[PDB]
Design a protein around this motif. Structure first.
Motif, PDB file in Angstrom:
ATOM      1  N   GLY A  87       0.793  -1.236   0.000  1.00  0.00           N
ATOM      2  CA  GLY A  87       0.000   0.000   0.000  1.00  0.00           C
ATOM      3  C   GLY A  87       0.833   1.299   0.000  1.00  0.00           C
ATOM      4  N   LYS A  88       0.372   2.311  -0.754  1.00  0.00           N
ATOM      5  CA  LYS A  88       1.041   3.618  -0.840  1.00  0.00           C
ATOM      6  C   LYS A  88       0.574   4.532   0.299  1.00  0.00           C
ATOM      7  N   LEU A  89       1.296   5.636   0.541  1.00  0.00           N
ATOM      8  CA  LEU A  89       0.978   6.589   1.614  1.00  0.00           C
ATOM      9  C   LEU A  89       0.194   7.806   1.139  1.00  0.00           C
ATOM     10  N   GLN A  90      -0.676   8.332   2.011  1.00  0.00           N
ATOM     11  CA  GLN A  90      -1.453   9.531   1.744  1.00  0.00           C
ATOM     12  C   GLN A  90      -1.095  10.576   2.800  1.00  0.00           C
ATOM     13  N   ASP A  91      -0.378  11.615   2.380  1.00  0.00           N
ATOM     14  CA  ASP A  91       0.018  12.694   3.301  1.00  0.00           C
ATOM     15  C   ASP A  91       0.471  12.138   4.651  1.00  0.00           C
TER      16      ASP A  91
END
Length: 126
Positions: A87-91
């Motif tokens: 999974g990628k990061l959001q802020d």
């Protein structure tokens, strides 16, 4: 949303954060978020080092709280059961979906167990 497990090449490399962990918290669902969060006993991170600001920058998973969305239907109360998380990061916060590479380490190949521990961040190409 309910898609089929997408190539780990793609999931590993396309994702901006991948780590093995245990679930040790419940999902927080805002009425005005569109997304939720789960708490997890992060065992070790495989992909995210550049995001490894301190050491542990992934201890909760942030998915959208929509209907046609692929949040994260988590069915595991075992705080001692490890897992695999692409999974990628959001802020800052992690993001995941049921169409992202996310399943029990324990269900992984011993080679792909190492591969994710050493080999799939540069050679993700399954």
């Amino acid at each position: 949303c309910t898609c089929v497990p997408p190539h780990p090449q793609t999931a590993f490399c396309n994702s901006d954060l991948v780590i093995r962990a245990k679930f040790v918290g419940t999902p927080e669902v805002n009425q005005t978020t569109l997304y939720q969060r789960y708490e997890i006993k992060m065992t070790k991170m495989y992909k995210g080092f550049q995001a490894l600001g301190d050491a542990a920058d992934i201890r909760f998973v942030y998915t959208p709280a929509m209907e046609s969305v692929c949040g994260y239907f988590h069915r595991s109360h075992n705080r001692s059961e490890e897992f695999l998380i692409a999974g990628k990061l959001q802020d800052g916060l992690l993001h995941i979906t049921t169409c992202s590479f996310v399943a029990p380490w324990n269900s992984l190949s011993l080679a792909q167990r190492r591969g994710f521990t050493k080999t799939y961040t540069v050679g993700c190409e399954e």
